[PDB]
Amino acid sequence: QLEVLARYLQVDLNKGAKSFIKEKEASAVLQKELDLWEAEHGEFYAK
Amino acid sequence: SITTARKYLESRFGLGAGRQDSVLLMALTNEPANRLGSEADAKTFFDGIAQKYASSAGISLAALDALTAENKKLAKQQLEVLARYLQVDLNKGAKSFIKEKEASAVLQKELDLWEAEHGEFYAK
Amino acid sequence: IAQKYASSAGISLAALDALTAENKKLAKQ
Amino acid sequence: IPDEP
Numbered sequence: 001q002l003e004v005l006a007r008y009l010q011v012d013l014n015k016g017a018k019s020f021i022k023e024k025e026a027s028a029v030l031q032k033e034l035d036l037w038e039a040e041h042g043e044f045y046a047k
Numbered sequence: 048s049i050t051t052a053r054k055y056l057e058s059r060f061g062l063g064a065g066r067q068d069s070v071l072l073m074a075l076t077n078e079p080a081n082r083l084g085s086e087a088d089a090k091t092f093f094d095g096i097a098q099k100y101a102s103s104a105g106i107s108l109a110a111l112d113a114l115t116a117e118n119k120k121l122a123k124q125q126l127e128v129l130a131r132y133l134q135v136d137l138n139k140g141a142k143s144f145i146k147e148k149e150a151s152a153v154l155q156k157e158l159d160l161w162e163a164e165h166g167e168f169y170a171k
Numbered sequence: 172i173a174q175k176y177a178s179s180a181g182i183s184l185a186a187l188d189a190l191t192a193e194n195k196k197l198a199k200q
Numbered sequence: 201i202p203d204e205p
Contacts, residue, residue, distance in 0.1 A: 001125075006126060016139070027150060064205070114191055114194075
């Protein structure tokens with residue numbers, strides 16, 4: 001019954017969850033760029 | 048003269064050089080058969096010839112929704128009470144979306160501290 | 172002159188509900 | 201109005 005009311009009201013039940021997993025791989029990209037700095041330069045220089 | 052035609056076709060009715068070029072040619076096919084008397088007649092003739100020219104070329108010169116919103120008002124209230132029954136959080140995805148979006152804003156705030164300090168050529 | 176006087180003073184001389192009732196007919200049942 | 205030569 002929950003899916004057919006969300007179908008009626010045009011409510012996406014996973015719009016928050018699809019945007020959650022799409023920013024979680026987007027913040028994994030900048031993390032993959034951020035540790036390229038610390039692997040290259042080191043922890044004392046970065047601090 | 049011909050100078051007055053430019054301001055009576057390309058200007059009056061808006062007819063530039065290109066527009067008047069084919070506008071004055073239409074007059075020939077239907078030239079006045081006698082010396083025109085009125086100065087307005089010439090303009091009228093030009094305007095009358097422009098119509099054909101334009102034609103020739105083809106370029107001429109409630110509550111139902113109030114009833115609808117109360118239907119979705121029922122189904123939205125039914126949607127919350129079924130999600131309350133099944134213990135389904137309708138915003139667990141949205142709360143975790145905005146909590147990682149400020150978490151990826153933190154690492155962005157650390158990532159541009161590197162490029163502001165070091166620069167784009169060194170970072171590339 | 173009365174017109175001016177009057178002016179001067181400013182004192183001059185469907186089925187939607189049939190669809191609606193069947194919606195409440197469902198909810199009442 | 202488009203000037204057409």
